[PDB]
């Protein structure tokens, strides 16, 4: 299969952005999705355990919609790459990348 993302996206300072990825061309069960901002963990959506949000993003992330993540109160420090890491049963990994530019405002 393959992972499709919005690619390069823009958002206004103080606004919100929905980070989303779509896994296509595989019927394998998605067991977990991790979200990273650059090399830092934002959140984990595990099919059984739900949503883990890292303490530094607790007040700024709204889990979902679905396997996506809503990042709120954007600042210029949120500009950069984000990754969605899909885990598929039994042992697969698919990684998508999004580049966000936060504009002043």
């Amino acid at each position, epitope marked *: 299969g393959t992972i499709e993302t919005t690619g390069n996206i823009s958002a206004e300072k103080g606004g919100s952005i929905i980070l989303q990825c779509h896994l296509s061309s595989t019927t394998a069960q998605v067991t977990q999705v991790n979200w990273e901002q650059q090399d830092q963990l934002l959140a984990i959506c*595990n*099919a059984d*355990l*739900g949503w*883990h949000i890292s*303490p530094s993003f*607790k007040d700024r992330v709204a889990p979902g919609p679905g396997l996506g993540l809503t990042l709120q109160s954007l600042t210029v420090n949120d500009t950069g790459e984000y990754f969605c890491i899909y885990h598929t049963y039994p*042992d697969g*990994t698919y990684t998508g990348r999004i580049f966000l530019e936060v504009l002043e405002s």
Partner: antibody
Framework: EVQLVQSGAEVKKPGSSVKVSCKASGYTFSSYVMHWVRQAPGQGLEWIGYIDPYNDGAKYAQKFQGRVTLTSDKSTSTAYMELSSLRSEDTAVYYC????????????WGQGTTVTVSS | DIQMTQSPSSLSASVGDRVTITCRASEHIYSYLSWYQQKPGKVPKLLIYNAKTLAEGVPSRFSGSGSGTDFTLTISSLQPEDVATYYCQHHFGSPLTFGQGTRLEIKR
């Protein structure tokens, strides 16, 4: 330093319920979930569930779903574990353990609460 | 449910020995495995999370390795304070489950 201080030992009759508390200090209570894990005498560790104080969302192991309730009070930074319909096999040390920043592992543990279930 | 099989169940070692404990998961759990130390009559303590990341304050003689289904906890040079039971735990589904533990004692 982070500390989790649990309530004292409990002695309960079969069929009753027990409610244990876990008071957190030294960190922002709502930024981390609180898990519960128990250990029967001479046995291994068994996870019960967690409460997320940020949104009052609880997750339970299927083995305890419907018999345990996990709650939290942000005003006092306290988590609670209420286990009902107690049986002698529920005799164990019950720990609260903070969920770590990067996933579902247990990074800080309370001192434990002994619960004896007996007639 | 994901089952965790730890081996050996018990190990006798001398101070200064290299100790290896293994943990096998019944499903591929990527690097979502943590290790705990429990001294007798004491509370469990996190040693390693995410298969290889040392927890704060844990000495360098402890290291974790592996991924997928097979994981190892190594103590490079055993110290007397390392006498404990060690547990692995996956964190890739519900219920979160632990291995049955490895009891470490000093050989004499």
């Amino acid at each position: 330093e982070v500390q989790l201080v649990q309530s004292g030992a409990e002695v309960k009759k079969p069929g009753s319920s027990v409610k244990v508390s876990c008071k957190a200090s030294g960190y922002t209570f709502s930024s981390y979930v609180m898990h519960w894990v128990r250990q029967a005498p001479g046995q291994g560790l068994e996870w019960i569930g967690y409460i997320d104080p940020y949104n009052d969302g609880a997750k339970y192991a299927q083995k305890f779903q419907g018999r345990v309730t996990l709650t939290s009070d942000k005003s006092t930074s306290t988590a609670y574990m209420e286990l009902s319909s107690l049986r002698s096999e529920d005799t164990a040390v019950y720990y609260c353990a903070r969920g770590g920043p990067y996933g579902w592992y247990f990074d800080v543990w309370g001192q434990g609460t002994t619960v004896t279930v007996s007639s | 449910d994901i089952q965790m099989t730890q081996s050996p169940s018990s190990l006798s070692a001398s101070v200064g020995d290299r100790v290896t404990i293994t943990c096998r998961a019944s499903e591929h759990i990527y690097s979502y495995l943590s290790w705990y130390q429990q001294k007798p009559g004491k509370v469990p303590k996190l040693l390693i999370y995410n298969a290889k990341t040392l927890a704060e304050g844990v000495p360098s003689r402890f290291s974790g390795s592996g991924s997928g289904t097979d994981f190892t906890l190594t103590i490079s040079s055993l110290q007397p304070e390392d006498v404990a039971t060690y547990y692995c735990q996956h964190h890739f589904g519900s219920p979160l489950t632990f291995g049955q533990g490895t009891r470490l004692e000093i050989k004499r």
